[PDB]
Design a protein around this ligand. Structure first.
Ligand SMILES: CN1CCN(c2ccnc(C(=O)N3CCC[C@H](C(=O)Nc4cccc(-c5ccc(C(N)=O)cc5)c4)C3)c2)CC1
Length: 121
């Protein structure tokens, strides 16, 4: 129903760059679209096909992990932990794991497109 997805966490495409970002559905607005509040505080309407109802991003998913500066790279989700309700992902790269905060994990277009079958609205 209309309220079923309100407050659910998603990973959804930002049209401008093809990447899928963490956020929550805030409203079913019709015409196949939902109002999203992204974790960066942007609120806008996104097509269901561009929303992965996927939280946490599961084990063995290839993601883009963001570091300090201009450093980002592909890695594989190998773990999850909470620290005061904020989520961290354990990302494996070249046999070495590091913890990343939720907003330091995004999906390239290709990485998000892989999950549409299983998680897309
Ligand atoms: C939902 N929002 C809407 C606004 N969005 C953009 C607007 C304009 N321009 C860009 C962009 O493509 N550029 C080029 C590249 C360098 C910059 C940039 O996006 N830098 C940046 C660096 C580190 C982390 C993030 C980040 C991580 C997570 C989230 C999240 N989960 O919400 C949002 C942003 C962004 C800017 C992105 C980001 C997504």
């Amino acid at each position: 129903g209309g309220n079923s997805f309100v407050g659910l966490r998603v990973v959804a495409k930002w049209s401008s760059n093809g990447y899928f970002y963490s956020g929550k559905i805030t409203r079913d607005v019709g015409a196949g679209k939902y109002k999203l509040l992204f974790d960066d505080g942007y609120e806008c309407d996104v097509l269901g096909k561009d929303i992965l109802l996927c939280d946490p991003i599961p084990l063995d998913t290839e993601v883009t992990a963001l570091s300090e500066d201009e450093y980002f790279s592909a890695g594989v989700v190998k773990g999850h932990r909470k620290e005061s309700g904020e989520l961290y992902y354990s990302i494996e790269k070249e046999g070495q794991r590091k913890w990343y905060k939720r907003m330091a994990v995004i999906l390239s277009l290709e990485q998000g497109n892989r999950l549409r079958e299983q998680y897309g609205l």
